[PDB]
Design a protein around this ligand. Structure first.
Ligand SMILES: Cc1nc2ccccc2nc1CC[C@H]1CCN(c2ccccn2)C1
Ligand SMILES: [Mg+2]
Ligand SMILES: [Zn+2]
Length: 313
């Protein structure tokens, strides 16, 4: 009850900033998350014992893959924390609860393979869930963990509030399927620019949370350049393993997954900054002005990839 989490001074200051890196000390990441729930949501939001047990079961159900791992979960939850803390009054009590949990759970039990590889492999998950295959599985794994004995962090919510929170989490997790991002952002762009965007309209709120979820998920592109560059190595370590698995099914992978085409990474990152990242943070900044530092940091990293192409690194 009277038991705050406190971080060392550098972390207590830097954790408030969008570009914070949670560091390489895995044993501190639960503490960093509880810290973020307590300041974001309240010390009263969750029973500490239940929250701690939930967090450690979530950790156990992330695998030792190079990128879609526990560190990614916590990283994506911190970007959400920074967005919530910079937009105090725009979000409901239930959204503040749901969204940090959604972020921590959003890639539960990821294997390091795309939806497209599961479909080509004919994985059982591709028969159970025909679109957003991994994302329906992540939501399914989240409900499983919520139902383990002593793991119900939502136990004090009413039946209908509990249903609303699980519905915020489900949509937030589905929204991380980048195939859905393009259309979501076009609609948000048209709504904002024809002045029809209405944050009292639930279906609008849903779109805006989806875009937040894309922004938090891609937040590697919003770090200081040395973090961006070293995270890129983990991202490609996954993609190139999938490429290898595609070649074992007798399928030429796309170039982003082909290790024979490493030379094309700089230009491939550029396309991605221009086609996905910059548009994402631009629309997010229009809807939520205090998220502008995410857009500024992405533009800084775009210019760093331009420098790599020009042989100045
Ligand atoms: C899909 C993706 N998600 C990210 C999320 C966070 C940070 C960086 C990310 N980079 C990518 C890869 C973009 C792709 C677009 C094509 N591209 C290529 C193409 C050829 C060779 C290498 N990369 C890379
Ligand atoms: Mg995912
Ligand atoms: Zn993710």
């Amino acid at each position: 009850g009277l038991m705050q989490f406190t971080l060392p001074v550098r972390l207590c200051k830097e954790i408030e900033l969008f570009h914070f890196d949670i560091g390489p000390f895995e044993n501190m990441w639960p503490g960093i998350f509880v810290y973020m729930v307590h300041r974001s949501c309240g010390t009263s939001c969750f029973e500490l014992e239940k929250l701690c047990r939930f967090i450690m079961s979530v950790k156990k159900n992330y695998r030792r893959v190079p990128y879609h791992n526990w560190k990614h979960a916590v990283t994506v939850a911190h970007c959400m924390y920074a967005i919530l803390q910079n937009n105090h009054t725009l979000f409901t009590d239930l959204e503040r609860k749901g969204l940090l949990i959604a972020c921590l759970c959003h890639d539960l039990d990821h294997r390091g393979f795309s939806n497209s590889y599961l479909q080509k492999f004919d994985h059982p998950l591709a028969a159970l869930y025909s679109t957003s295959t991994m994302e329906q599985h992540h939501f399914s794994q989240t409900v499983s963990i919520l139902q383990l004995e002593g793991h119900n962090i939502f136990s004090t919510l009413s039946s209908s509030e509990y249903e609303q929170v699980l519905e915020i989490i489900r949509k937030a997790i589905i929204a991380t399927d980048l195939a859905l991002y393009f259309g979501n952002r076009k609609q948000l762009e048209e709504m904002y620019q024809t002045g029809s965007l209405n944050l009292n309209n639930q279906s609008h709120r849903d779109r805006v949370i989806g875009l937040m979820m894309t922004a938090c998920d891609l937040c590697s592109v919003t770090k200081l350049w040395p973090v961006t560059k070293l995270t890129a190595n983990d991202i490609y370590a996954e993609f190139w393993a999938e490429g290898d698995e595609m070649k074992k099914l007798g399928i030429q992978p796309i170039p982003m997954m082909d290790r024979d085409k490493k030379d094309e990474v700089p230009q491939g990152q550029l396309g991605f900054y221009n086609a996905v990242a910059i548009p994402c943070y631009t629309t997010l900044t229009q809807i939520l002005p205090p998220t502008e530092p995410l857009l500024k940091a992405c533009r800084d990293n775009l210019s760093q990839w331009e420098k790599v192409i020009r042989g100045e690194e």
